[PDB]
Amino acid sequence: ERPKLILDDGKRTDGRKPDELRSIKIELGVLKNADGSAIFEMGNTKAIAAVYGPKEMHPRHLSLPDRAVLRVRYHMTPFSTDERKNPAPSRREIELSKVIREALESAVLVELFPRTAIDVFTEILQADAGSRLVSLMAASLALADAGIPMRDLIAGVAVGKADGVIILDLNETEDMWGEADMPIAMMPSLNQVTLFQLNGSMTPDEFRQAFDLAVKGINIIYNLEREALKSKYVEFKEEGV
Amino acid sequence: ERPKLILDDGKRTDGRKPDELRSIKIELGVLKNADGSAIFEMGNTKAIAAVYGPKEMHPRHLSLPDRAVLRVRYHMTPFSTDERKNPAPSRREIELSKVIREALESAVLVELFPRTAIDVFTEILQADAGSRLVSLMAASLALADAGIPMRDLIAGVAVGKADGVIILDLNETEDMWGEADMPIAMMPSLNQVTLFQLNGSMTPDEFRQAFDLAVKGINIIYNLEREALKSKYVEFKEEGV
Amino acid sequence: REMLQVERPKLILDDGKRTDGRKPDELRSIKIELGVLKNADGSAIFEMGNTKAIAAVYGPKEMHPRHLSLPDRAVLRVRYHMTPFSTDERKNPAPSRREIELSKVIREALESAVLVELFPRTAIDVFTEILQADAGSRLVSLMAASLALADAGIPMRDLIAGVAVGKADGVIILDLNETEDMWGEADMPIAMMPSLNQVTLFQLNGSMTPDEFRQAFDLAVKGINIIYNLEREALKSKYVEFKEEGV
Amino acid sequence: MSSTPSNQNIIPIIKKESIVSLFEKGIRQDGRKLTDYRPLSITLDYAKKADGSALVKLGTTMVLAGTKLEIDKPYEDTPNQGNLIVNVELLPDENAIELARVVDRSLRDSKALDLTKLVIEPGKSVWTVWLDVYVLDYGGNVLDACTLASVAALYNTKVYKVEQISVNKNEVVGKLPLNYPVVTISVAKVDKYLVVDPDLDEESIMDAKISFSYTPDLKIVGIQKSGKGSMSLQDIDQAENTARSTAVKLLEELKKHLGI
Amino acid sequence: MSSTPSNQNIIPIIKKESIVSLFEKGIRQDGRKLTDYRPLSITLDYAKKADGSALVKLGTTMVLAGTKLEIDKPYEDTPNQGNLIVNVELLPDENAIELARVVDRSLRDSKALDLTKLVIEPGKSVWTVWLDVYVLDYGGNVLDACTLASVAALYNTKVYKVEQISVNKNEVVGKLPLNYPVVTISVAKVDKYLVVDPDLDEESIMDAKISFSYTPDLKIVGIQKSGKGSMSLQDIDQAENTARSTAVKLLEELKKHLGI
Amino acid sequence: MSSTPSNQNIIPIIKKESIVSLFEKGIRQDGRKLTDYRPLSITLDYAKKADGSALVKLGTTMVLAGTKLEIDKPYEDTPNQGNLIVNVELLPDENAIELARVVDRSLRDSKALDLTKLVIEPGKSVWTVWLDVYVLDYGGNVLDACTLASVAALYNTKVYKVEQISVNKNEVVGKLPLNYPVVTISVAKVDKYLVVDPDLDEESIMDAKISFSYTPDLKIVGIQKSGKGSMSLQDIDQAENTARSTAVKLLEELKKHLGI
């Protein structure tokens, strides 16, 4: 009835070990009419991000005297999931927009552009769990593509707990049926956590173990981001931490 | 199958005579972060009102050159009634918001604060009829608590007709099943009517009689309001006009 | 198999005549009156057969939130709306996707005629209400608007006149019924500034060969030219009645 | 959120005094007395695709009301009643809602329209009467015109044959179960004067207005105070006196338009 | 309410004359002729969790269309038809609505997709085809790319097995009942010139544009004029001529992408 | 669209340094320690017409939570579960949504409330628990007060007799199927210091805060980072340590208020 997540063999439903990331694909400057853009893929999670660069703000009373305003949109296309998602923003979509915005606000040097708006639009084209992170990373990279000054790049992974077993980078299968789902995002060079959420249940110990595993995953992703910055295109087949 | 609303000792469903107010409880300065606040109780009708004092207005084109704009919100909490009210503003809530705003506009000396907004938020915590008035009085008192200059305090009661009998300060039972429901509010010292509505049916004579009875009720309430202003707290057990 | 005659009705009948007794080249009756609303800057009622529209213009005025205004032009604010009792089954008052599109289409049509440059930082409000729908309402609305603008004395390149031309039973027809819209192969609303030969609105839903398209197009012009003269006359006399007749 | 209208047309003291000066002589700009109504036109069946309709011209105010009848399952709480839904639109909201509700209240509480006679199959199917009222021209005292338009539209309403499940819209069975017409009379307080049926200029200078709704045997059936100002006890006393003796004339005129 | 967009980026006369000067020599900024289309890319099944999908690159314009199929009770106003619901999103509304409806109309009126073949259990259950079209990059002439994306997505759409009540999403039964592809061709009026498939700069300087939808046999299946300006009779005449001979080339290319 | 709040009450560097200087001595403006909670009041059954309710005063923050129970057909994608719907209102949205969802998550994932015990007729009828949470006074750390108000409101909730189809609201059958209370502890990062239960001033100067939700057996049941700034790995490590030993005290105090 309800899927088994660790097979006798110690592997997960997609054949991965607990310490293995999904395949990663990143490309930059994919939209001609944006100031910066990026497509990010973790396994079957695809996100596209467009940045419309620092610009004077439409209604001025909504602008800030010392900073740029970040405007962030997290959105899922109706055909990103198995059942068709309603295009109207969900409570989930509204929360994640905020969570992602705050995450970016901690990285982007907004003080540099007073009275301006920076627009960041995210679209999940395929959801397979961890979309909030893939979105955030695509955003982070699209900002870098726009040449917007930031403290560091942002890298993230959802760490979790499957059958008592702490696992790295979740499936929708693992998300839906697991005991825990803990998306974590950092500015890896600064060891600064940018996004941090847990839904589900963990003992402090498990929390600490999972946290360590996220860091190793994040560090691998980070190097890929760095490389994507130079070559504009990066493919990474799945492998162990 | 309706209820008999007057028993043959001359008393109402709650044991009151036709000329008796419900118990009244008033307290001021109950919210620390508001500029003025008040809780008002008539029987089982509870309202809380917060005033956010005279302040420059967010979008300036919406401000007035010679006056303050009053912004009033009449709202019922979902758990104020027997069946759960939808938090989304109802046509009733929209109309009462306007009626209450106009009432307050006749009292508050808005000319004194050009280009500013005065915010008045009302919440009904328990509805037992007459909530629009309890809301208005709470508002009136919260304004006084904020030290906002006004012509007079506002005191009100719903006067009505039960079983051909003119009664003072209605139950939900009486509101639901009565022939008439006439909320009236004044600035008692000025003998100026601030809110005036009738739903139901009355002969001009009955109208005039009910009008007289409201005044006596209003005058009693008014003294309590005055006292609440000095002592910040007033309790009044039910009694005859 | 052999008893199953079709389901759609014939639209071209005895003689060469249509369901309402018109020939293919005949307009519906037209009624126009101006200055019908006292509190508007300009107003007009327009009627084509059983299609009635009222239009109010609230003349050039400084715009509420200024950031929404334009430095060199007036902003046109146009509302196309159908009253709930304009059709057979009650229409929901909430704006439909159709109502939103037609609002835009009509606005653009007016933008091409109105000399907006003359009034920078101002808004011109144009409210349209369909009181009875019998097809061609988008055009009746646009014309009523055009005329309400003239009633307000707002300078324009030309007046706007329009008609829906279409295809019934392989036959090209002028100025459609509810019935003809509902069962025809084609429905092609066309609107012009006739003196300038400038097309202001142009749409086709349905299907036509290029030849049929060109023929229908010619017929619309003749109809438009007749309607135009009536508009012109409505401008002088404030009231015009025109019984149905051939192009 | 309800806020003081920022568009509000502020009318100079000099012009106000002009108008007051006239009231002191007991006359208005248009030349009528303090207790007079504006000229009244009613055109019935103006909106042809409506079940019943009325175009009301009261001074420069125009209102077109139209009815539409549909078969609905009744509400589980009101099992033996048809439905009335009133809706108002201003074209030149909140005021629109107030108007709709005030009109509604006066039609419902008076029982002018008897909802219990709109039942077809009890608990199964009832008539819903959609009343849609469109203010086309804002000339002041819109409420009174809305009531007139509404009442007229209801009286103009044709009811159709019921295939029992289906409606047959070319056999007119009868009319709405109406007991009587109702009128609303608005009295405006301007300075120390009371004025019936205030026009646009009068409404902009008034302290407040108060509207009374009456049935033909002169029972009060709704009251609604309106406006940002206040009014004295005796003002309201006199206002209702004035409103009532005005109601008689207006009801008569209304009946003439309706064919009684 | 529909109002003149205040965001427009008004494009200086000097730059406009630059472009016109090129038109006079019968060439454009990107180097194509007045009647040429931009380069066209189509990637099928781009969105994996969609039933069918297509990524369309037309010049710098990008559109991703995706279909999703669901079982619904048919609408009681169309008992023997499945449903098509088209939806457009601009990411960089009203224009979105226009686009959705124009695309819809051209698919529906043409009978390119046959809705009557989407019936499962007549009156009981039908297929609803949700078509969601996402404009990812606004490079001008969005409508034409939307039509191409929509047609391609439909042709890419897999239909699943129906457990009769339930859908089985790992047995692909067939494809959509499609009769033929359709193309929309947009022709822009700029100065005295007609230009096919206008780019971003061209769209900002145009008087107006007109879009024609064609079936493979070359029947006109929709027309929509667009823009703040007007167009002469003969402009429209020539535009459709031009549009039509372009349609042939575009249909051929579309078919190559679809595998005919 | 989510955008940086323009109303933000930017608090001068001078005042911030003032507060930091105090933290350096391990004390705050109100005089509590870095790890202390503000004074806690809980008044049960404050909202009489609610099925269960609670008024929470935590420092100057006030939250009134109230429950309402209703019979519903269960959701198709959850046939053997009752429903919990949490809703938050700020009165002095987006933050409101976040709060609602965070609270929801901690109640739901913990199985503090057991939804499967809210089934009446399986597949036919279940209890829906509407939890409405009103922030009356914004004094900082609203989330922790919301959890406390929600938990207390659920524990105060009376369940009524079920006439089997109908509810009888004057026979109290029992209480909600609650397993245990839950608390959320917020830890704010200010400069290089960690502070429990930040007040209004503290929240405006913090880099970020992180909220941990615990069950009585000290299992972590939800985590939410909040704020415009970032936080180090070790900050979070220490924060949870601190949060946990705080949780014990807070749970004890909560139980005293609830009558365990």
Ligand SMILES: [Cl-]
């Ligand atoms: Cl996710």
Ligand SMILES: [Cl-]
């Ligand atoms: Cl009330």
Ligand SMILES: [Cl-]
């Ligand atoms: Cl039409």
